[PDB]
């Protein structure tokens, strides 16, 4: 399964210019495009090699889409401040996430189009791609306006048609990037806390895609409530890293095993100090 997702952020700054609009687009865990309204000459910019080869018409049209969206988000922020009766002095954020998930059969599995205001759910297109779920009274104003405008029909046309076609095109043109899996390189490190205790840290490095499971077990029983687990983080080269750690009695290190699951592994790994 694969996905294409767009992430829009608009932030007002009263007294310091018009709102800034940022857009990024991803296929699965790989970014391919960026736009920033505050750049000197704002243009859609490639972030992956499999879109750098698109012609000038593609890039002009994408740029024009983002410029229009930035202008639309300025009016949305003004409308929202009014709906909520917020003071004109405060900074506010509007976020949008939309895109399409393809199933294993390469067909549309789910389309989505949802919005948050000041980091909180505001309105979302339902899975049927015909109706809306509004999170509060202010969002019911937007819901009525979009129902009147038949907004869902326009978004449904994109999510069911255009979005899927773009995703399939990118998956093919970027297949060497997007349709690989890099398995994690794994190892355990050992750090004495005292003469009596040590932490064992199980590392997974260099893997793609980002989804992964790391678990510590002890004589066969899993240690969920005593495992320190950091959020999966980017290496910066397109791949990801993660570690999981436990604190263990000195002399009992050998009783613990770390277990790694990733789609790129030929079989699950078990590591023992």
């Amino acid at each position: 399964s694969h996905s294409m997702r767009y992430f829009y952020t608009a932030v007002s700054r009263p007294g310091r210019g018009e709102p800034r609009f940022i857009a990024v687009g991803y296929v699965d865990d790989t970014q391919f495009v960026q736009f920033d309204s505050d750049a000197a000459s704002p243009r859609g910019e490639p972030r992956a090699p499999w879109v750098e080869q698109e012609g000038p018409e593609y890039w002009d049209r994408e740029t024009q889409k983002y410029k229009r969206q930035a202008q639309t988000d300025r009016v949305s922020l003004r409308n929202l401040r009014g709906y909520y009766n917020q003071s004109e002095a405060g900074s506010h954020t509007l976020q949008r996430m939309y895109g399409c998930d393809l199933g294993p059969d390469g067909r549309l599995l789910r389309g989505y189009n949802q919005f948050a205001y000041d980091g909180k759910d505001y309105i979302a297109l339902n899975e049927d791609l015909r109706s809306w779920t509004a999170a509060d009274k202010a969002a019911q104003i937007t819901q009525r306006k979009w129902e009147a405008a038949r907004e869902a029909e326009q978004r449904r046309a994109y999510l069911e048609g255009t979005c899927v076609e773009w995703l399939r095109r990118y998956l093919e043109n970027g297949k060497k990037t997007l349709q690989r899996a890099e398995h994690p390189k794994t190892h355990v490190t050992h750090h004495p806390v005292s003469d009596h205790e040590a932490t064992l840290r199980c590392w997974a490095l260099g893997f793609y895609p980002a989804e992964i499971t790391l678990t510590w077990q002890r004589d066969g029983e899993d240690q969920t409530q005593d495992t320190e687990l950091v959020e999966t983080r980017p290496a910066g080269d397109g791949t990801f890293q993660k570690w999981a750690a436990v604190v263990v009695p000195s002399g009992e290190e050998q009783r613990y095993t770390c277990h790694v699951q990733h789609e790129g592994l030929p079989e699950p790994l078990t590591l023992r100090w």
Partner: peptide, 10 residues
């Protein structure tokens, strides 16, 4: 390719 038709003003 981004979703560009229409004007989705809240």
């Amino acid at each position: 390719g981004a979703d560009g038709v229409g004007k989705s003003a809240l």
